[PDB]
Structures are given as structure tokens and as C-alpha cells.
Symmetry: C3
């Protein structure tokens, strides 16, 4: 259980990082995004 939860949490961290990059690009208009 705990090992599997470590994996889910790591995957969520990756998903959140990608969302943060995409949102910062929208907010700042980077490269015309």
C-alpha cells in the first residue's frame, strides 16, 4: 500500500509540475502562449 502510494504521489508531483509550467506560460504570455 505505502509503496504504491509513493508512486501515485510521485506521479501527481510530475503532473502538478507540468501544470505549473503551463499556467505560468499562459499568465506571462511566453513565446506567444
Amino acid at each position: 500500500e505505502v509503496e504504491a502510494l509513493e508512486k501515485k504521489v510521485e506521479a501527481l508531483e510530475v503532473k502538478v509540475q507540468k501544470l505549473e509550467k503551463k499556467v505560468e506560460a499562459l499568465e506571462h504570455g511566453w513565446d506567444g502562449r
Copy 2:
């Protein structure tokens, strides 16, 4: 503890999925969003 953490993680997964949909809609201009 572990059971309660499973619930928090599942709820986060749902929140992240909704964020991903909203961000993809903004990035692509779907339906004028």
C-alpha cells in the same frame, strides 16, 4: 492514517484532472475558452 492518505491522494488526482482539462481548454481555445 494510510486509508485516510489514500482518500486525500484520490481527491488530489481528481482535482489535478480537472485542472488539466481547464488548462488544455485555455491553451487550445476550445469552444472559445
Copy 3:
């Protein structure tokens, strides 16, 4: 392990909340965002 995972999950919750605010601001055009 479990204690450390509680911390990671709490930090993710905070990150997700901030993303939700930023995305709602983009979607609604609040304050010209």
C-alpha cells in the same frame, strides 16, 4: 515513510490550491488576468 508522505501530500494540496486560483483567474479574466 508515512509521516514523510503526509508532508508531500500536504505540499501538493497547497500547490494544487494555488493552481486552482490561477486557473480560475485566467478563465474569468479577474483583474485583467
